[PDB]
Design a binder for these strands. Structure first.
Ligand SMILES: [Zn+2]
Length: 384
RNA sequence: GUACCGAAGGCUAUUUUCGGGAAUUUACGACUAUGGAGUGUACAUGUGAGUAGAUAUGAUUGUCAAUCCAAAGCAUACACGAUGAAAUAGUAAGUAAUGUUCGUGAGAACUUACAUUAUCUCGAUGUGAGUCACAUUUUGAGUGGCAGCUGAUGGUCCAUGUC
DNA sequence: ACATGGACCATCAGCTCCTAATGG
DNA sequence: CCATTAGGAGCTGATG
């Protein structure tokens, strides 16, 4: 049972400069490996495998030119990890799993630094502070939410990140699973929609978190901040005052607003899944929703993006696999929103803008409720 | 002491706490020195436009025919503003006392006591001395009530502005 | 069509051994 | 000298 415990940390200035330098070197190494591979193909030679690119770097390039040996000044493990995940892009493009590599490009916050447990005595953790191989003891803001070494827990590896003025660490731990739950309640089903987040085939209704006053106020604030930030770029285009500081401040503010909205939405999804799973059903059937096609509709794109259907599905699948539940999903073209629950009529004149379902037998119910009931008693499905 | 901003890892708290605090009620966080006229709202007003976009909805061999359907911008209305808007460059966001130095300024550093989650603080239990020490302890905890499975690669969408 | 600078979407995986240097 | 802590090599054979 692989897990992760992502927590915010408290580096010092000397540790902050180390983190920044390591990330910069890793980005440079990724780009350099890509370019050298391109040049080799241009000539007509074979493919360098990354594990051999490192050997070429250590024994055939770095001695040759003494100009750039700052590479062996930052941790030698993060550099190797960056090279390997650069070669993973190529090995995924050779197979038809992905597209051609993409040249990380200077300046973002998506590149992290990787550390591993090398010796039998590092990566020791307490209620406060953790020991990371590149930096030493690093303080931890939240106490107890990282498996300590006092109570027989071991960290395999980890990653240090940086998002909007804050720093985080994410460590992965093998967890033993106990308390085998016995599921015996009647099964349920949930329909995912845009008027409400979810409607369950038992009566429970979860409203759209995006239709609340707080999120609307946040969106207004974000639009105002973006409009104010775009004036500084226009001003910068004219003069020669290239010492942008208010631009950095505005960028930080925009990133903070985005992060806050993400926090609200993620908390809502996690708590909703918690309540649904704690209700303890035997099985649940959901859908095979296609979000790309729905997002191709211009007037539905923003709402569908802000609803986060696929993330909810993945987290629900993880929790179901963890709690011993079974997840059922149906075909992409299963007639859920058109089939009556009494006679089985598959009426076709159902307009997309009707909130009430009415067929010939006289059955009348909400469209979402009818869809949830159709989902709960589905016959053909394949378990996720 | 309201809307907002900083901190207490995240969400929430009308009856959690410590600070700053308005262009003041679907309510443009506050000051500093230059800078001189704009900035904000229309989720409680029209046109762009049945237009872009989507259709496991029908007919002939890409059109026809039915069902849902934007946004930018322009135009209007209202609000605040020469008691100083945008932009540029900075300052602070635990409490008291004393006296210097530094900066144009908001302010900062060096001393004292308090408070506080100071690479730890607290609780509990046991032993010993006469309230203080030494050990063990996460099934103990970090303002209440609640939840946290991350990384890599690629793809696709979105917002703001100029022409 | 350029820049700005974000988010979510699908699918696939999560590091060991041996040597060689560092502080009193 | 010495428990610690760092570095170098490893596979994969492929229409940037
Ligand atoms: Zn019927």
């Amino acid at each position: 049972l692989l897990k992760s415990f992502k927590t915010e940390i408290n580096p010092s200035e000397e540790q902050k400069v180390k983190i920044h330098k390591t990330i910069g070197t890793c980005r440079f190494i990724y780009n350099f490996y890509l370019a050298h591979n391109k040049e080799l193909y241009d000539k007509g030679e074979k493919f360098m495998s990354g594990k051999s690119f490192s050997v070429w770097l250590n024994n055939e390039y770095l001695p040759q030119n003494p100009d750039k040996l700052w590479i062996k000044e930052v941790s030698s493990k993060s550099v190797k990890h960056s090279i390997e995940n650069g070669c993973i892009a190529f090995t995924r493009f050779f197979k038809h799993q992905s597209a051609f590599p993409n040249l990380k490009k200077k300046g973002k916050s998506d590149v992290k630094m990787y550390f591993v447990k090398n010796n039998p005595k590092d990566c020791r953790c307490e209620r406060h502070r953790i020991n990371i191989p590149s930096l030493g003891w690093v303080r931890i803001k939240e106490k107890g939410y990282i498996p300590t070494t006092k109570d027989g827990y071991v960290i395999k590896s980890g990653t240090v990140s940086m998002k909007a003025d804050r720093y985080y660490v994410s460590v992965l731990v093998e967890i033993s699973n106990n308390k085998i739950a016995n599921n015996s309640n009647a099964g349920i089903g949930i329909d995912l929609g845009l008027k409400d987040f979810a409607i369950v085939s038992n009566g429970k209704t979860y409203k759209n978190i995006n239709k609340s006053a707080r999120l609307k106020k946040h969106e207004k604030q974000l639009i105002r901040e973006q409009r104010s930030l775009s004036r500084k770029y226009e001003n910068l285009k004219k003069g020669e005052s290239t010492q942008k500081a208010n631009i950095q401040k505005q960028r930080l503010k925009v990133q903070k607003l985005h992060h806050r909205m993400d926090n609200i939405r993620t908390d809502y999804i996690n708590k909703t899944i918690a309540e649904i799973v704690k209700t303890k059903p035997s099985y649940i059937t959901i859908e095979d929703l296609n979000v790309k096609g729905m997002m191709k509709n211009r007037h539905l794109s923003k709402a569908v993006a802000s609803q986060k259907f696929y993330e909810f599905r993945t987290k629900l699948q993880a929790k179901c696999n963890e709690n011993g539940i079974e997840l059922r999903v149906v075909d992409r073209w299963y007639p859920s929103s058109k089939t009556c629950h009494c006679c089985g009529a598959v009426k076709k004149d159902l307009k997309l803008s009707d909130r009430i379902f009415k067929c010939s037998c006289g059955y009348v119910e909400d469209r979402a409720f009818n869809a949830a009931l159709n989902l709960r008693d589905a016959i053909t499905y394949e378990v996720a």
